[PDB]
């Protein structure tokens, strides 16, 4: 055939892939974390948006740190051979490098490691997207008037 460049990911597999949405709104009283009002609006908007992009959207609400790890592990162990990509959206409280389960923190690295090129072979060479809505610290941006 003609010249082949290969500058863009192959996105024409039978399935676009999974879009896992972890929506943590309510946290255990013991953690002292406040409820995240408005997160359901985000979760619904994401579901509809990725639905239209042809992703297999799966939503989970208020997961403990254990459930988050279990979910990610299970998902990474599925056969993604016929899927073009993988998407995971995390909606919760957080700090730099951390996302909170309803009962405690989860290192983002622990979550993403399950999808490493050598640990999830059916996703090797395919784009793995992690969308994170959570704090990364306590700094505030005062902004600057534009001109």
């Amino acid at each position: 055939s003609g010249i082949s460049l290969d500058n863009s990911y192959k996105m024409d597999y039978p399935e676009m892939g999974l879009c896992i949405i972890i929506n943590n709104k309510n946290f255990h009283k013991s953690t002292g974390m406040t409820s995240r009002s408005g997160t359901d609006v985000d979760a619904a908007n994401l579901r509809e948006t990725f639905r239209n992009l042809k992703y297999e959207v799966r939503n989970k609400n208020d997961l403990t740190r254990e459930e988050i790890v279990e979910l990610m592990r299970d998902v990474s162990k599925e056969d993604h051979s016929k899927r073009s990509s993988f998407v995971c959206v995390l909606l919760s409280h957080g700090e730099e490098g951390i996302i909170f389960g309803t009962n405690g923190p989860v290192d983002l690295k622990k979550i993403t490691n399950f999808f490493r090129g050598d640990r999830c072979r059916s996703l090797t060479g395919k784009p793995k997207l992690f969308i994170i809505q959570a704090c990364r610290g306590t700094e505030l941006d005062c902004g600057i008037e534009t001109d």
Binding site: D6, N7, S8, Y9, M11, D12, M16, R36, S37, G38, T39, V41, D42, N45, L46, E48, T49, F50, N52, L53, S85, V89, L91, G94, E96, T112, F115, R116, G117, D118, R119, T124, G125, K126, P127, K128, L129, F130, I131, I132, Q133, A134, C135, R136, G137, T138, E139, L140, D141, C142, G143
Partner: protein, 103 residues
Amino acid sequence: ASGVDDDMACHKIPVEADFLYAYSTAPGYYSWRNSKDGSWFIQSLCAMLKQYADKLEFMHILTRVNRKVATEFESFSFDATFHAKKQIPCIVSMLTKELYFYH
């Protein structure tokens, strides 16, 4: 030219390759959420995806998200400490190819 670290017989890629982290805010910063309308970042991301997913490469879509959040949003708080603040999302790409949701 020839060397010890290139043109390997057995092709390998980094285990950390092909990951994209779309952070709602810059490293070390709080992330803002409207208790009624949702987070500034997710609101904007969905809006840009709905409008440009069948037209632009993903990084360019995320760049539009960066501009939308940066220009259109500013916090409101009765607490002066948290009032009138801004936010800039943070795109972290370890991708090796362009990404289009369409084909």
